[PDB]
Amino acid sequence: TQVLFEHPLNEKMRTWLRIEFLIQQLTVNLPIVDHAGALHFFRNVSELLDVFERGEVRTELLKELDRQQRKLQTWIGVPGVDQSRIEALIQQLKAAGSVLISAPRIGQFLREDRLIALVRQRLSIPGGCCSFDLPTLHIWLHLPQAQRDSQVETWIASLNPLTQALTMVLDLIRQSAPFRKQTSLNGFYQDNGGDADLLRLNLSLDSQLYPQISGHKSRFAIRFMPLDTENGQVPERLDFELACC
Amino acid sequence: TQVLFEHPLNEKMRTWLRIEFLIQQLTVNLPIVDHAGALHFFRNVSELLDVFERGEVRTELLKELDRQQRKLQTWIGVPGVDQSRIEALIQQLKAAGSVLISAPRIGQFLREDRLIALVRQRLSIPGGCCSFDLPTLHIWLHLPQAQRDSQVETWIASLNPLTQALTMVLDLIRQSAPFRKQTSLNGFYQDNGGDADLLRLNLSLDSQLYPQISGHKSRFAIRFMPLDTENGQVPERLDFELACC
């Protein structure tokens, strides 16, 4: 009966969350059988390439992978903790890293693909991607299903070195911190984030509201606002759980 | 074993085909259960409003409805044809027309909707529509399914006067002309379209190619190009069916 809100506390976590989201959307509506499925797929690809054009994700994500290995290394001597399970986890990190750096250009396969590039151009036009403006797509959707599935696989698997490394670090961020109980007065809250990239906030579906998070330096502030901007309102004592990961 | 290609021969048919496509995409992936379904829905709405902003569809579509009534009126005296079936069809046209003109602003309900407008802004940003940038959407997808379905219904039904009238005329355009057998030499063809808005072209899935249609005045020209820009090519005698609707 709870709703989890994730909020990035730096431009790093923003990009990673956007990329994580865009990548998993590719594999959500498979297989591609119709226009809807195709346009959903290609647009997610198109939006992925646009994010990639903004800089090099490779360099940041590789620094983050190394960062996590050093943290796990701090836990070796601790009583009770098991060695061969984190060192295997460390070994998976170095593997995800070595593959990422040795990987080709990111999104280049998708960038160079004739059909995808031909759809990418027509996406910026509201009614652009119809059958008469994309006969090439229209004829592609009449092909045997097995031919499309093979193309889709090669397209998604080209993002495998990135997908791996990224999934690794986000899975290790979301496990680094526990949910601490906090309370808000009149729908307001603030704290010093510190050295965290991600806030994880559990509310309540029945609580009738959502968090609006702002930031300054390494500090954050939450103003809980009612989903209904008119019919419903914050209490003066709102209990919630928040993790600083 | 055939593939049908539709191509608009004027700016009218272009708009109508784009709108027809956008409207039916709304009802394709229902119900909205996740992000993918939601983003697909809202973007189609957003693209619909952008097309509406470009002019008044109402005026053209109403002139087209009247146009079809006059054509049906020409068929009254013809032997063999049945009266009460076209006059009922005529009566449905005048009904679709009277409702369209008496209808409110087109897309205004969707335009004014808080959630939709809040998503419309974030659609122009590649990774914009994530959970942390749209907490309002994130919390909406956690609501009971019955609440979303009710909202979706009110949203789609607001387009009912337009959807009706439009579906009427396109259904009457696609029935006005028969498929005549034609042949192309070395993948080229041209004719005088005349008073037609739509070309309907049947090829063959095994034919290994698609039509690339250009236009000048009321004339059109087709250059059949191989789907594989490298591995496959047009014959020198390509038989196909084409209707000038």
Curated annotation (Swiss-Prot), chains A, B:
Disruption phenotype: Mutants are viable, with no discernible division phenotypes.
GO biological process terms, semicolon-separated: division septum assembly; FtsZ-dependent cytokinesis
GO molecular function, one term: protein homodimerization activity
Gene3D superfamilies: YacF-like, YacF-like domains
Pfam families for this protein: ZapD (PF07072)
An annotated GO cellular component: cytosol
Intracellular or extracellular location(s): Cytoplasm
SUPFAM superfamilies linked to this entry: YacF-like
InterPro entries reported in the protein's UniProt record: ZapD, ZapD_C, ZapD_sf
Coiled coil: none
Record's keyword terms, sorted: Cell cycle, Cell division, Cytoplasm, Septation
Record's subunit section: Mostly homodimer in solution. Interacts with the C-terminal tail of FtsZ.
Family indicated by similarity: Belongs to the ZapD family.
Free-text function comment from the UniProt entry: Cell division factor that enhances FtsZ-ring assembly. Directly interacts with FtsZ and promotes bundling of FtsZ protofilaments, with a reduction in FtsZ GTPase activity.
PANTHER family for the chain: CELL DIVISION PROTEIN ZAPD (PTHR39455:SF1)
Name of the protein this chain belongs to: Cell division protein ZapD
